[PDB]
């Protein structure tokens, strides 16, 4: 699953 | 040395794709004891995200290899020693960041945006620790992550718009935290859908570039919401 920085 | 120098060296480091340097620099700026600009706050965030992401992928690989049918007890021993070498590294990185969050960044946070941002970061680098934690030390880390995420969340609800990227960001990682760490799809899908529907409810009044970073994050929320429910 993808995410964000 | 001046922040200005460190920040430039950190930007140079980014383009050079040398993130150990980058983080070490952004760390030096944090330790000066002054609140970061939204630029300096995003350099640090990026720096350590890569510094850690390396060990994470390294760790995961050696964990998939150590899964394979290995005969040589030696080859099996070094596999563990190496996975553990990478863990201790993965751990130092997290502690160093969580140290910065606690000592300097979170307490110096002045704006609601910043506070929420650093609290999400705190949650992340506990979630990282919990991936390679063991015994009782695991339960502690898993819990601390949720505290940080949760604290961030109630600030974001009270101080920020549903479409605000930092809040959209928190929603994503926190929903993901539930899914991977606590192995709970319902909560994961629950948090994602809410963060998503609250967003489209007020996504027409915000337009163009405030709406670019927002949609992208809402993209990922939707990508997880589908995969998980199937
Ligand atoms: C990106 O997603 C991965 C997998 O869900 C997660 O491990 C990581 O924490 C995310 N990135 C950030 C900056 O949280």
SSE class of chain B: mainly alpha
The first-level CATH class of chain B is given as: Mainly Alpha
Please give the alpha-carbon distance between the first and last residues of chain A: 14 Å
Helix proportion of chain A: under 10%
- Shape verdict of chain A: rod-shaped
CA-CA gap between termini of chain B: 53 Å
How many helices of chain A does DSSP assign?
A: 0
How many beta-strand segments of chain A?
A: 0
Query: What share of residues are in beta strands of chain A?
Result: under 5%
Q: Supply Rg of chain A.
A: 5 Å
Assembly context of the chains:
heterodimer
| CATH homologous superfamily descriptor of chain B | 14-3-3 domain
Per CATH, the architecture of chain B is: Up-down Bundle
Helical run tally of chain B? 9
Family (chain B): Belongs to the 14-3-3 family.
Organism (chain B): Homo sapiens (Human)
Modified residues (3'-nitrotyrosine) (chain B): 82, 104
InterPro entries (chain B): 14-3-3, 14-3-3_CS, 14-3-3_dom_sf, 14-3-3_domain
List the helices and strands and how they pair.
The complex is a heterodimer of chains A (5) and B (230).
Chain A (H helix, E strand, L loop, with lengths): L5
Chain B lengths: L2 H13 L3 H12 L7 H28 L7 H36 L3 H20 L4 H24 L5 H16 L4 H16 L11 H18 L1
Bound molecules: 2-acetamido-2-deoxy-beta-D-glucopyranose.
2-acetamido-2-deoxy-beta-D-glucopyranose sits at the interface of chains A and B.
């Amino acid at each position: 699953p993808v995410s964000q920085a | 040395m001046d922040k200005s120098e460190l920040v430039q060296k950190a930007k140079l480091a980014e383009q050079a794709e040398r993130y150990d340097d980058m983080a070490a620099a952004m760390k030096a700026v944090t330790e000066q004891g002054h609140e970061l600009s939204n630029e300096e706050r995003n350099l640090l965030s990026v720096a350590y995200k890569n510094v850690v992401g390396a060990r994470r992928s390294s760790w995961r690989v050696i964990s998939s290899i150590e899964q394979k049918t290995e005969r040589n007890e030696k080859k099996q021993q070094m596999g563990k020693e190496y996975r553990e070498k990478i863990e201790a590294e993965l751990q130092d990185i997290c502690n160093d960041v969580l140290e910065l969050l606690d000592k300097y960044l979170i307490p110096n946070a002045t704006q609601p945006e910043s506070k929420v941002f650093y609290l999400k970061m705190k949650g992340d680098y506990f979630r990282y620790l919990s991936e390679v934690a063991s015994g009782d030390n695991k339960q502690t880390t898993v819990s601390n992550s949720q505290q940080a995420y949760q604290e961030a969340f109630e600030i974001s609800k009270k101080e920020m718009q549903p479409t605000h990227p930092i809040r959209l960001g928190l929603a994503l990682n926190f929903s993901v935290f539930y899914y991977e760490i606590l192995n709970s799809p319902e909560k994961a899908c629950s948090l994602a859908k809410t963060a998503f529907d609250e967003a489209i409810a007020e996504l027409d009044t915000l337009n163009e570039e405030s709406y670019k970073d927002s949609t992208l994050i809402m993209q990922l929320l939707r990508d997880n919401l589908t995969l998980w429910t199937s």
